[PDB]
Amino acid sequence: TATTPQTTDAPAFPSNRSCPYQLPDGYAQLRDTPGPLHRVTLYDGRQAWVVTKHEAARKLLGDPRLSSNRTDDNFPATSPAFEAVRESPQAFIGLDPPEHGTRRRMTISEFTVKRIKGMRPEVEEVVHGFLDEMLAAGPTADLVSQFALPVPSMVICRLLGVPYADHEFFQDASKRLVQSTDAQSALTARNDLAGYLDGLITQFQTEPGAGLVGALVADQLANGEIDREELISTAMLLLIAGHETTASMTSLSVITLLDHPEQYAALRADRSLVPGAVEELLRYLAIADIAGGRVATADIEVEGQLIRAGEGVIVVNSIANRDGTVYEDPDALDIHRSARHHLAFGFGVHQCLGQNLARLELEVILNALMDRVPTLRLAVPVEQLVLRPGTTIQGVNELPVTWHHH
């Protein structure tokens, strides 16, 4: 057996959070090591680079030599479940320019600033509606299943034209796909969603439909500008991202804010602080911190280190968002700080399409919780919560909460 010291200079990656709003111990070590890159070992033994510093993360996310093609054999897989993505058709998150832009531009009209503004009444109505139901249904609740997940789910379904009557099916399928640990169950969940979306496309070809899927069917698909399979992949990407990211931000923001009651109280006293607090929570919680997988298609020199063609690179935006040369005392939550330039949404051509919808949802949600349930508190200690592993979007699958009755 192994009878020698076990220290490595390529630690296992990813690591799991033990506290919802702090770096895993291994990530703090990576943050502290000088230099933009560090070697890591992925689940299957293959070595990869992680980017651990803020400016280098921007530079490398902007470098066209780091491809987003998940079907490349050398793309960095962080769990066996990734092989489902490598073997499946790709939405534009997995495309490089110029193909990336031709698909992304088919969807941007739904996510413009003007459109996001017009969505405020629907978002406020959805948030307060689910709040009405939860506040009436019990002294305690699971904030995730009763509030954090249904709210962004209903909103993105309206944007897409996906009927919410099927929400039990596709919410469950979304969860299985994002949170699966093995390739078979990820593949089944993708096929479940794909078959559902394919039937919706045929329905819209018979009776033109609402929302973005309706528009893609009536226009780009009818002109042959997007393949049917690509339309499915695109709708699936938007559906899942629209569900899972905002829901995780909501639950983790509640946990984090209740552990910083002085800042939560200041926020309640001055709602002009809510947009800045949302930016700080995005920086601090960085829930998609592994969404920056890339593969080099050519050699890239980075500050004396060399990324060789064919190596995998993961831009770890949670670590980059704790760069003390950008955010003073980076491990402190400070809703009054400038969290500008954070990487929670990435950077460059793939920067999050939904970022301003997410910012709107989280502002409405925080204002609604402070308005309607100012007495909200966790029903279990933080040490009893179960955090998702570092191989998926960060969050908690259950969040027991209570408040003052009626």
**Residues whose CB falls within 8 Å of the CB of residue 248, separated by 6 or more in sequence, listed in order:** 148, 287, 393, 394, 395, 396
Q: Measured from the CB of residue 105, what is the shortest distance to ligand HEM in angstroms?
A: 10
Q: Is 405 annotated as a binding residue?
A: no
Q: Measured from the CB of residue 266, what is the shortest distance to ligand HEM in angstroms?
A: 23
Q: In this complex, which beta carbon is closest to ligand HEM, that of residue 146 or of residue 233?
A: 233
Q: Residue 127: which of 318, 315, 365 has the closest Cα? A: 365
Q: Measured from the CB of residue 350, what is the shortest distance to ligand HEM in angstroms?
A: 4
Query: CA triplet 198, 95, 205: central angle to 5 degrees?
Result: 25
Q: Could you tell me which stretch among 129-137, 163-171, 183-191, 243-251 binds ligand HEM (CB under 6 A)?
A: 243-251
- The footprint of ligand HEM on this chain (CB under 6 A) covers a number of residues equal to 26
Write the binding mask 265 to 294 for ligand HEM: x where contact by CB under 6 A, - elsewhere. ----------------------xx--xx--
Q: Figure out which of the listed residues 53, 104, 158, 337 binds ligand HEM, where binding follows CB under 6 A.
A: 104
Q: Figure out which of the listed residues 357, 365, 366, 373 binds ligand HEM, where binding follows CB under 6 A.
A: 357
Determine the Cα–Cα distance for residues 58 and 242; give it in Å rounded to an integer: 24
Contact between residue 5 and residue 297 where contact means Cβ atoms under 8 Å apart: no
Regarding 399 and contact with ligand HEM (CB under 6 A), the answer is no
**Residues whose CB falls within 8 Å of the CB of residue 306, separated by 6 or more in sequence, listed in order:** 299, 300
Regarding 101 and contact with ligand HEM (CB under 6 A), the answer is no
Write the binding mask 174 to 213 for ligand HEM: x where contact by CB under 6 A, - elsewhere. ----------------------------------------
Q: How many CA atoms lie within 13 A of 355 on its CB side?
A: 17
Binding residues for heme: 100, 104, 294, 350, 352
Residues that bind ligand HEM (CB under 6 A): 68, 92-93, 104, 156, 237-238, 241-242, 245-246, 249, 287-288, 291-292, 317, 344-346, 350, 352-354, 357-358
